[PDB]
Amino acid sequence: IEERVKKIIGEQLGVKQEEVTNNASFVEDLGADSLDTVELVMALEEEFDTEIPDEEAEKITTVQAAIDYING
Amino acid sequence: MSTIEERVKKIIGEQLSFVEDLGADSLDTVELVMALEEEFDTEIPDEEAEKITTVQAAIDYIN
Amino acid sequence: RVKKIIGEQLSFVEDLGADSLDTVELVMALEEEFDTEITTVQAAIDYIN
Amino acid sequence: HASIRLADLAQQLDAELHGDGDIVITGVASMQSAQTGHITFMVNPKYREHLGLCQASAVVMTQDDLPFAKSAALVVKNPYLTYARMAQILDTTPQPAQNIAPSAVIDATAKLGNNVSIGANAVIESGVELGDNVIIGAGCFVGKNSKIGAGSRLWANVTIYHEIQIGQNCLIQSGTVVGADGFGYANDRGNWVKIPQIGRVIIGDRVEIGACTTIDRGALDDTIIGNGVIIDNQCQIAHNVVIGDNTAVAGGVIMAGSLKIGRYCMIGGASVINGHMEICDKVTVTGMGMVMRPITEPGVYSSGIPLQPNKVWRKTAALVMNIDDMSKRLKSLE
Amino acid sequence: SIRLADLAQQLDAELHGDGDIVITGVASMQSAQTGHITFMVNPKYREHLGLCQASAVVMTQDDLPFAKSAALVVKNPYLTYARMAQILDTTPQPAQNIAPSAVIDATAKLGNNVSIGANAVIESGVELGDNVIIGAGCFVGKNSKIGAGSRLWANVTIYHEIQIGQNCLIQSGTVVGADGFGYANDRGNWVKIPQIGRVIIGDRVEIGACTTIDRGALDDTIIGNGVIIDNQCQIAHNVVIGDNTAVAGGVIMAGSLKIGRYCMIGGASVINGHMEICDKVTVTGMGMVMRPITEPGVYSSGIPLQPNKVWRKTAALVMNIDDMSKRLKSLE
Amino acid sequence: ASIRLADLAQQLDAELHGDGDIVITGVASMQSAQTGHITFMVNPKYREHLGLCQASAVVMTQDDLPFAKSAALVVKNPYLTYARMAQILDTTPQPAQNIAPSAVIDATAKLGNNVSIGANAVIESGVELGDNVIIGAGCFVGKNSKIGAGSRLWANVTIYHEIQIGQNCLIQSGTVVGADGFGYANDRGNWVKIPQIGRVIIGDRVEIGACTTIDRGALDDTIIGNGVIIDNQCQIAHNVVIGDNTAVAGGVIMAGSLKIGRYCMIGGASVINGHMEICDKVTVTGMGMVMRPITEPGVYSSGIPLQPNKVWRKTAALVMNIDDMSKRLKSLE
Numbered sequence A: 001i002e003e004r005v006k007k008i009i010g011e012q013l014g015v016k017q018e019e020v021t022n023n024a025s026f027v028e029d030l031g032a033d034s035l036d037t038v039e040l041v042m043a044l045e046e047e048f049d050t051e052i053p054d055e056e057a058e059k060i061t062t063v064q065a066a067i068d069y070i071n072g
Numbered sequence B: 001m002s003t004i005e006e007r008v009k010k011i012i013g014e015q016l017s018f019v020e021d022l023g024a025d026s027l028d029t030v031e032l033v034m035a036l037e038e039e040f041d042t043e044i045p046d047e048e049a050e051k052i053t054t055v056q057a058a059i060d061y062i063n
Numbered sequence C: 001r002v003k004k005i006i007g008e009q010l011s012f013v014e015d016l017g018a019d020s021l022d023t024v025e026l027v028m029a030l031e032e033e034f035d036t037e038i039t040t041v042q043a044a045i046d047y048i049n
Numbered sequence D: 001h002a003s004i005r006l007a008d009l010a011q012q013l014d015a016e017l018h019g020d021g022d023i024v025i026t027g028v029a030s031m032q033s034a035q036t037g038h039i040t041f042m043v044n045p046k047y048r049e050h051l052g053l054c055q056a057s058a059v060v061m062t063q064d065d066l067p068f069a070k071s072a073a074l075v076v077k078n079p080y081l082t083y084a085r086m087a088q089i090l091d092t093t094p095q096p097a098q099n100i101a102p103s104a105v106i107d108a109t110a111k112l113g114n115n116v117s118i119g120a121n122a123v124i125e126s127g128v129e130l131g132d133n134v135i136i137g138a139g140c141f142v143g144k145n146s147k148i149g150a151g152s153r154l155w156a157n158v159t160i161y162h163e164i165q166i167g168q169n170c171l172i173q174s175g176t177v178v179g180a181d182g183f184g185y186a187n188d189r190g191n192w193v194k195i196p197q198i199g200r201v202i203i204g205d206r207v208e209i210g211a212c213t214t215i216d217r218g219a220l221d222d223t224i225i226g227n228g229v230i231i232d233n234q235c236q237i238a239h240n241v242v243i244g245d246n247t248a249v250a251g252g253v254i255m256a257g258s259l260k261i262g263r264y265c266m267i268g269g270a271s272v273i274n275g276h277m278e279i280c281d282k283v284t285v286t287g288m289g290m291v292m293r294p295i296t297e298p299g300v301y302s303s304g305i306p307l308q309p310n311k312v313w314r315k316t317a318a319l320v321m322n323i324d325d326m327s328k329r330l331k332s333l334e
Numbered sequence E: 001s002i003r004l005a006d007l008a009q010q011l012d013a014e015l016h017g018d019g020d021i022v023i024t025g026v027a028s029m030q031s032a033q034t035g036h037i038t039f040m041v042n043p044k045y046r047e048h049l050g051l052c053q054a055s056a057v058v059m060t061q062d063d064l065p066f067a068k069s070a071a072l073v074v075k076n077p078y079l080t081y082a083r084m085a086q087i088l089d090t091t092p093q094p095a096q097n098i099a100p101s102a103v104i105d106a107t108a109k110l111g112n113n114v115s116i117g118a119n120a121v122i123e124s125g126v127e128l129g130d131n132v133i134i135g136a137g138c139f140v141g142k143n144s145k146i147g148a149g150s151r152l153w154a155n156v157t158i159y160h161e162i163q164i165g166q167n168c169l170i171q172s173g174t175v176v177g178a179d180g181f182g183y184a185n186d187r188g189n190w191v192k193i194p195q196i197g198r199v200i201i202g203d204r205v206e207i208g209a210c211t212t213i214d215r216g217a218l219d220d221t222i223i224g225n226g227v228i229i230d231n232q233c234q235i236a237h238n239v240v241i242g243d244n245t246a247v248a249g250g251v252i253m254a255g256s257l258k259i260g261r262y263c264m265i266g267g268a269s270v271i272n273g274h275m276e277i278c279d280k281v282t283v284t285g286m287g288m289v290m291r292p293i294t295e296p297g298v299y300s301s302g303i304p305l306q307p308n309k310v311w312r313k314t315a316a317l318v319m320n321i322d323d324m325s326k327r328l329k330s331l332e
Numbered sequence F: 001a002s003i004r005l006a007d008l009a010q011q012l013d014a015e016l017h018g019d020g021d022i023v024i025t026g027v028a029s030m031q032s033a034q035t036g037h038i039t040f041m042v043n044p045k046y047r048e049h050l051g052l053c054q055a056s057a058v059v060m061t062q063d064d065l066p067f068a069k070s071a072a073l074v075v076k077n078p079y080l081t082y083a084r085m086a087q088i089l090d091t092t093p094q095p096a097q098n099i100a101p102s103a104v105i106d107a108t109a110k111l112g113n114n115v116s117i118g119a120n121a122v123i124e125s126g127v128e129l130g131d132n133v134i135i136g137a138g139c140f141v142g143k144n145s146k147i148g149a150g151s152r153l154w155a156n157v158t159i160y161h162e163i164q165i166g167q168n169c170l171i172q173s174g175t176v177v178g179a180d181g182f183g184y185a186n187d188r189g190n191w192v193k194i195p196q197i198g199r200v201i202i203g204d205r206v207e208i209g210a211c212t213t214i215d216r217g218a219l220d221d222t223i224i225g226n227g228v229i230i231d232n233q234c235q236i237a238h239n240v241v242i243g244d245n246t247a248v249a250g251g252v253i254m255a256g257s258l259k260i261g262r263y264c265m266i267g268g269a270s271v272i273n274g275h276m277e278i279c280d281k282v283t284v285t286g287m288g289m290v291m292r293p294i295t296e297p298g299v300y301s302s303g304i305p306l307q308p309n310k311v312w313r314k315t316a317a318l319v320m321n322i323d324d325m326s327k328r329l330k331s332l333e
């Protein structure tokens, strides 16, 4: 699952896997723009068949934060 | 629970004669009708939506 | 029957003046009229038949 | 400075005077800022209860307004119109110029009518014809063989190209360009070959044009501005655009080439209109309009999704992009 | 005035009619008459050609059958139209001779057959190449260089340290080299960033009226060769436009934008800054260019007009498209 | 021009780390800077790029200093320090130098000390130019207009009558200030002009871009707050009021009787409805369709971004028919 979420980030955000480290910030380290973080959440919702409340989507700003939500 | 009048008034207050006394936009009166449709689970024909221009008219339709 | 609809909406592009939105909208209108879920008149008539 | 008896003014405006007709009016002002000697007006009945706060010597209003009046009143049926009239009688606006300036450059072939004024460092080309009472603002340029009808006025730094024809009683604000090359270019395997624009701009009578607006000449036939037309600032009128009489174009509108607008239309500001098409009479396009297609029936037309808080818009936007996805899920739910 | 045969060869066209016909100018089908030459491009116009009173009509080898007068057969009527309109161009020049009224600094160096219109102003250090024409009331800033054959219509503003190539044409009201929008936010307050960069305009560039192209902050703003820019455009500091790219009217560009070559920007498009648009891209009108464009093709945006009452409903449902998305999933 | 790095560091209140005898000839980018050039760095990502920059000195933050590969001026805000040092080494000339004889000045115009007027510039009557004022060439200043001290106009700027411009303001070329607002009453289809007798009041330290249009008011004045900055191609209609230190980017169209608050930042090509108000500290993103008033501060946005054509064609048609699908969804519930 960790690997799969991370694979999505690379596809959505357009970065090679080596750059998508656990402590990386989507915006600050990975270059993401005003709509990608939303589109990423949408891609995770589809892939893992789950609805993410916006109070929590807003706190997912790093990959690790994303992994943890999905595992739960 | 809640009366019809109170429910109509609550919706209006949250969204915002609608245009003159309060200050409606070209969208707000439409959005208000949609919200009323939802709250009361009812479909409002635009011929009638068009007649909803006051607080009382909204109360009256549901009534 | 199909052809009357085409006329109402409006090769679609080269002879009948269509814009980019219309050919998409034309397909959509046929879906409703014929309730079913193509660049020329002839292509539309033959498939639909 | 002006000065006029309230009675005289009421008569010039055809108004029912309720008050001292011997009051002298010196000008026109807003309710908030009016002083003694000033006249104002009232259109919105919300300002009724406030009328007592006003220091104006007179207020232009309606019959149903008269009860709430707390001043001398000029009762009419359409205040905004009589406001417009009395604003003209008490206009303070100076002239773009008076008499012929020495620094100006006027070619000897130029045909100058009677009581014509040309400002400083203005430039009149050959074959030009300026009718009577015409005023050319300072620093203007009027191209070869162009004619400007009588009474018409240019403010400072206006540019008129060649073969341009303007009717009479027209007014053009500064920065405006009339008769520049339309955007005409042929493509030859990647490169752009120019298409000389040998057409013109024909501007009717009583036409008013705003500042830094551009009206291009036609490619072959003419770009035509009907009579009584008013155009705001920052507008772009493409080559071979035809605009009908009395149509209004608010600021920042981008018109494409070979666009035809009928009579009595109102094009909202920042609207963007496609070319090689027609808009019928009595059409109103709301602001930021995306006029992609022709309009055949009169009425009001609109487009655009307004503002939302940024975080909300991110999600609204992303969803509208994925709208084909929605309609496939919904259909599969049937 | 020209003979149709001598015209037909200059355009490299197959003459099919009386070559001794006299041509006097260009005009449209619907209004051309005797003495005039025209063209047609749309096949639909064939069955109406006889109604055109033109002396001659440019067309293709396939249009030849429906010919109803002297024909000029070519591959690209629109191109042929362009050239035959240039041969018969009636457009005058922005200026001839050098005006006594014009103010020219001593340190300014002029070429040959240079024209400067009335009351135009030329600052210090300016180099004007051969056959360069400066329209009336124009301003050319310090040390700016304008290449050969380049023409400015009346009332154009060139700032200091600007470079215009050869055979360029700038319409009136247009401003080149004004300070870019550079400001530092000192705790709510704006401190100016002096824009010491420049604008480099290449060869054969044409710019419309009332258009603004700002100088770069430190490095330069670049308008490549063969670029065409319409009216009312804003090209911010450090924008770079590839060769032969076309920018239609009313387009707003943000700074540090790079556009490749052979691109076509539809009018009223709005392009975000600090990103690239690759070669061979077409953006349609009113385009909302928020992101970079990495591969060629056509990109579009915008929801068009609807009758006002319909728009209202359309608008409100979209602003609540989220709820509508939640409703959709909850029914799955 | 040429200055000493150590002296420069003092004027910027910076921490000189390296040879202070380094002579700086000018300012430049990292990409392009060579010797004599000072540059700067705002992003931490470009820390590695310091080893490819042939600049003599780089303005960075204290936390960047370990990455320094040349002399370094350390500060709290490299971008603001760039602004300051750029002003010191600013190569930008003036619109003019003193009064050109080519100009046409009315006898009644009141000049301050050390006023400059460009060539063929035209000053009307009653005009008052303050001290150290510079009027660019081909400009036109209307009757009774006031331009405050230290304010400057570039070539071919137009100021109408009765305009009031504050101190140390800058206006780029092509810009028109004080033209008639779009004021017309309708009489049975015909338009009757409403003379615009209001003015434009411009505060202090206001900078306006090129080919911008700020119209005079109908009755009351159109007001630009202090420290406000406006970009090119903007339309500011009659009776609009802008708060101090607000920023407006390129291509913004403002409708009449709009009040914009302080420290707002209006995105480019945005379109703002009139007869309403925007509160302090509001940020409108680019192409913003501002149809309603804004009562609470924050960031607001609108507009669906680009899509491939074929994708858009289908996106557009579905939105245009979104009501039909909203209904056939409501039924399905």
Ligand SMILES: CCCCCCCCCCC[C@@H](O)CC(=O)O
Pocket (backbone or CB within 6 Å): D182, D183, D216, D237, D238, D239, D254, D255, D256, D257, D272, D273, D274, D275, D290, D291, D292, E230, E248, E249, E250, E266, E267, E268, E284, E285, E286
């Ligand atoms: C729905 C948006 C439609 C797109 C509108 C594009 C307007 C571009 C301005 C055209 C300027 C003309 O001089 C060139 C022309 O049009 O030939």
Ligand SMILES: CCCCCCCCCCC[C@@H](O)CC(=O)O
Pocket (backbone or CB within 6 Å): D232, D250, D251, D252, D268, D269, D270, D286, D287, D288, F181, F182, F237, F238, F253, F254, F255, F256, F257, F271, F272, F273, F274, F289, F290, F291
């Ligand atoms: C979001 C819809 C709002 C559309 C407003 C477009 C901007 C209008 C241009 C300003 C024209 C004013 O000089 C006239 C006025 O408005 O008084």
Ligand SMILES: CCCCCCCCCCC[C@@H](O)CC(=O)O
Pocket (backbone or CB within 6 Å): E181, E182, E183, F247, F248, F249, F265, F266, F267, F268, F283, F284, F285, F286, F299
């Ligand atoms: C989320 C941030 C979006 C920003 C909205 C647009 C900002 C308004 C433009 C102001 C221009 C200044 O900033 C100067 C500059 O920047 O050169």
Ligand SMILES: CCCCCCCCCCC[C@@H](O)CC(=O)O
Pocket (backbone or CB within 6 Å): E180, E181, E182, E214, E234, E236, E237, E252, E253, E254, E255, E256, E270, E271, E272, E273, E288, E289, E290, F231, F232, F249, F250, F267, F268, F269, F285, F286, F287
């Ligand atoms: C639709 C995406 C947002 C597009 C924003 C376009 C804003 C245009 C600003 C032009 C003014 C430049 O001088 C500012 C800069 O230096 O960028």
